[PDB]
């Protein structure tokens, strides 16, 4: 038998090309491997985690190294709003001379790619000033990578393999992750900011050479130990402070100013330092909750068992959940992915509105790239969370041990849940599409005054509550007389209200009927994607059509054409369908973000306000209008620096469309075709000297769905990325 | 020897040598009967 894959004899004995494909595709599903024990599983996962951390640190090392070596960081910091930051050098012998010239327009004498990752802005903010700073950073992270790699190896050695009990010590892990991983890391970062970033921002060099002798504040730690902490707030940077200079510089190391530094258009560094110090305290306190080796603290199991509402509406409450969660890595991974998915979206939303990095608000292409990047990542994480939730229900859920707890009662009313999600999706769909189409028809026939245009008054009211004066709602922070307004008036409110009421930033954009309709579109997307994923999870174990589905596993082709036909009945198929909806939803919201900003940055908000209420407006004024720079990256007259994006744009279209082949044409067609090819090979002279070792077969039913989805998704991203980048570069 | 020579040495190796050695090794691995 062909040895590969060694972890599955069933696959190893397969005489066809399917052996290789399925070998690759199941290599990381450790639970499914031959003769896996629970202890070996946890040990292998732990080592794999070390490997992953090393890869992250090598990637960061490479970014630092390439910028240090081939970048223009030292030149860029002298004029950050005018010079383009360099990602890395190009060496490509396929280039003709005209393309070499087109990519050599960034000050330096060799072809380069411009960076849109925002690394220069970040590194400058946090106190980096030279290529030697970057280089030593790169060296340091090489060493950290190696350390994690070594720890990975070490913890697979007999006398260093941790026990299963160590891996299920929930209370200790939570204490250390809260107080140490989060709390102390946050405290150390506040240290960096106070000792290095803030001095460097005021023109003072602080490095490893002089930091032991250079006090962050003239008063030292005397005020700290005397509880005279207000000393550290005295004398903030003036509104005329010129970043990276002493002109207008303050002495304060901790503040609560609110809003933005006028020059850099970013959050004050002294606010950021104080933020990190304050949350560090909270995290360190939070990490003393759970009982470890000294009797004080809580048991997680005891908390869960006790949380039953006495009126009985939650049944037995959270009884049994501790064991359910503690024995299921899929439950845990689903929780982790969901939570991280929410946080990644929050990062996208908060970083565009409240930027922390100097001059990044001016780098429009970077702002667009970063928003789109993080929202797409968040989308993937959310789908994965639900995928692992479904896998949990098949592989790890024990009905007996969860009887009448909150988890079991979800399954008890799954039809109520699914049918209501169906209703809300239909309700949003019919009416949102309906209004858009009303508007298109009435505008097309020359009567824009007949449009249905709903003011988003609830969102405008929430803006007013945070102090946006535009609407005249006179509520809370937008009223002078409010207790809310009075309470904060001597602290953050002056700085905050200035930023809110400034129209030349992204902090609470003006919103109108256009913003109303696309928010309901987004809501449609969230509900429908959720419908598909929830139906996936709650029907993973069985349905009327297939009552014994749990016996077939997460992923299987179907159950044949009987009982009416059962294509796409598995919980894996729900993941596959949800991916199309996730990509759609992310399309709508990123189109929205980008068009709203293109018109803001371009000084024509009216274009968005008028065009966005009917769908031809998006098609014409967004897609068609902004395509022009991109598709002229190369043409019969020559090439410019958008040539590469133009080519990638077409590559994306090609990959996407190739996906349709796998999604539309299904397996049996191809297997018959491959038979005739096997026939021809064996009957062709000379050629039939050569013999396959693996019998060629068409891809499996599930494999086709996966390969089709992969092409569809890769094509989606490789189309949109060049557009979003070249559109903005082309305009500004 | 200087550093500006490095792309012209390395890119051909990472692009035309490393992958084909890797492909060859993987091919031998997956066809072994053992």
């Amino acid at each position: 038998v062909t040895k590969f894959p060694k972890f599955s004899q069933a696959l190893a004995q397969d005489p066809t090309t399917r052996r290789i494909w399925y070998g690759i595709a199941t290599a990381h599903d450790f639970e499914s491997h031959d003769n896996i024990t629970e202890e070996n599983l946890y040990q292998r996962i732990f080592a794999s985690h070390f490997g992953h951390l090393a890869i992250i640190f090598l990637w960061t090392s490479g970014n630092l190294f390439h910028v240090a070596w081939q970048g223009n960081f030292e030149k860029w910091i002298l004029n950050p709003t005018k010079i383009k930051p360099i990602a890395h050098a190009i060496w490509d012998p396929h280039f003709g001379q005209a393309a070499l010239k087109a990519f050599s327009q960034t000050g330096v004498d060799y072809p380069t790619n411009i960076s849109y990752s925002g690394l220069y802005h970040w590194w400058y903010t946090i106190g980096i000033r030279t290529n030697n700073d970057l280089y030593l950073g790169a060296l340091f992270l090489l060493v950290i990578s190696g350390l994690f790699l070594f720890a990975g190896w070490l913890h697979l050695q007999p006398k260093f393999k941790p026990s299963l009990a160590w891996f299920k010590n929930n209370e200790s892990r939570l204490n250390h992750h809260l107080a140490g991983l989060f709390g102390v890391s946050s405290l150390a970062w506040a240290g960096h900011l106070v000792h290095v970033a803030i001095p460097e921002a005021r023109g003072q060099h602080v490095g490893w050479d002089n930091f032991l002798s250079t006090k962050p504040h003239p008063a030292g730690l005397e005020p700290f130990f005397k509880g005279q902490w207000s000393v550290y707030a005295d004398g903030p940077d003036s509104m005329n402070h010129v970043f990276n200079t002493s002109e207008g510089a303050g002495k304060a190391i901790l503040t609560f100013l609110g809003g933005f530094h006028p020059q850099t258009k970013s959050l004050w560094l002294t606010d950021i330092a104080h933020h990190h110090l304050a949350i560090a305290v909270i995290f360190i306190i939070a990490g003393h909750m759970y009982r470890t080796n000294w009797s004080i603290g809580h048991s997680l199991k005891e908390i869960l068992d006790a949380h039953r509402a006495p009126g009985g509406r939650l049944g037995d409450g959270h009884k049994g959940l501790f064991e359910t969660i503690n024995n299921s890595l899929h439950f845990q991974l689903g929780l982790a992915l969901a939570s991280l998915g929410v946080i990644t979206s929050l990062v996208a939303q908060h970083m565009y509105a409240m930027p922390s990095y100097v001059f990044i608000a001016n780098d429009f292409t970077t702002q667009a790239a970063l928003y789109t990047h993080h929202q797409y990542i968040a989308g993937f994480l959310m789908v994965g969370a639900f995928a692992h939730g479904a896998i949990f229900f098949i592989r790890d859920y024990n009905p007996e041990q969860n009887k009448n707890n909150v988890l079991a009662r979800m399954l008890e009313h799954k039809e109520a849940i699914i049918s209501h999600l169906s209703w809300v999706s239909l309700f949003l769909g019919f009416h949102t599409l309906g209004i858009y189409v009303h508007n298109d028809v009435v505008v097309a026939f020359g009567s824009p005054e007949k449009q249905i245009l709903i003011e988003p008054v609830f969102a405008q009211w929430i803006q007013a509550a945070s102090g946006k004066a535009l609407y005249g709602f006179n509520i809370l922070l937008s009223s002078s007389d409010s207790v809310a307004t009075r309470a904060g008036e001597s602290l953050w409110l002056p700085g905050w209200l200035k930023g809110v009421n400034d129209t030349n930033n992204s902090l609470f954009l003006d919103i109108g009927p256009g913003d109303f309709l696309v928010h309901h579109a987004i809501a449609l997307g969230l509900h429908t994607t959720t419908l598909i994923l929830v139906k996936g999870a709650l029907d993973a174990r069985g349905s009327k059509l297939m009552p014994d589905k749990k016996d077939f596993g997460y992923s299987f082709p179907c159950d044949g054409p009987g009982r009416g036909g059962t294509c796409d009945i598995s919980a894996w198929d729900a993941f596959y369908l949800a991916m199309f909806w996730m990509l759609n939803t992310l399309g709508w919201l990123t189109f929205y973000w980008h068009w709203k900003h293109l018109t803001l940055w371009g000084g024509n908000v009216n274009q968005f306000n008028e065009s966005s209420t009917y769908l031809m407006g998006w098609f014409r004024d967004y897609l068609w209008l902004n395509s022009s720079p991109l598709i002229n990256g190369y043409n019969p007259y020559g090439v410019n620096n958008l040539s590469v994006w133009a080519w990638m744009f077409l590559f994306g279209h090609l990959v996407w469309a190739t996906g349709f082949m796998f999604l539309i044409s299904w397996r049996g067609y191809w297997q018959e075709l491959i038979e005739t090819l096997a026939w021809a090979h064996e009957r062709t002279p000379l050629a039939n000297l050569i013999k396959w070792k693996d019998k060629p077969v068409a891809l499996s039913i599930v494999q086709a769905r996966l390969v089709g989805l992969a092409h569809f998704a890769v094509g989606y991203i490789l189309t949109y990325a060049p557009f979003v980048i070249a559109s903005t570069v082309g305009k500004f | 020897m200087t550093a500006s020579y490095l792309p012209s040495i390395l890119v051909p190796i990472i692009g035309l040598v490393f992958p084909f050695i890797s492909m060859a090794l993987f091919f031998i691995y997956v066809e072994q009967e053992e």
Partner: peptide, 28 residues
């Protein structure tokens, strides 16, 4: 700015994760 010497030091140091990666890979 960054010298040939500095680039060679980086390349030499990058052998440490390379070798260790090989070891981890094999052990997994």
């Amino acid at each position: 700015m960054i010298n040939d010497s500095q680039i060679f030091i980086a390349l030499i140091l990058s052998l440490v994760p390379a070798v260790l990666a090989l070891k981890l890979a094999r052990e997994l």
